[PDB]
């Protein structure tokens, strides 16, 4: 059935970073079929394409599909990028959905 995702994003955490990787992940809702593009911007600006991306796991008993779009990027590049971006573009809506965010600022995941 015709539905529209979420607004939903979340950067690399440390927790990530200890392995030396760090991919932002953004969140999708009950919406159409596969049948849906995805994409990743850093401060308005569209990364270098080739961003990681799921399996259609679509079922019929959800009668939906909705997975988690990871940025190819690496830990010490986390650095370079504060403000992150998912862009959704669907059936259900031809205008691309992109949900931006300061993490910098947000995102505190820091100690003594």
């Given at each position: ?7 939903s ?11 030396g990787?760090?991919?932002?992940v953004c969140?999708?809702?009950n919406?159409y ?5 995805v994409?990743?911007?850093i401060d308005?600006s569209e990364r ?7 399996w259609?796991?679509q ?5 939906t599909?909705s ?6 990027l690496?830990?010490d ?6 403000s992150?971006t ?11 959905i992109?949900?931006?965010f300061?993490r ?9």
């Open positions: 059935a015709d539905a529209a995702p979420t607004v994003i979340f950067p690399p955490s440390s927790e990530q970073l200890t392995s990787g760090a991919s932002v969140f999708l809702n919406f079929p596969k049948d849906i593009n994409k990743w911007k308005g270098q394409n080739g961003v990681l991306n799921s259609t796991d079922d019929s008993k959800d009668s599909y997975m988690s779009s990871t940025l190819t690496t830990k590049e986390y650095e370079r990028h504060n992150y998912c862009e959704a573009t669907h059936k259900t809506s031809t205008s691309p992109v949900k931006s300061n910098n600022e947000s995102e505190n995941l820091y100690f003594q």
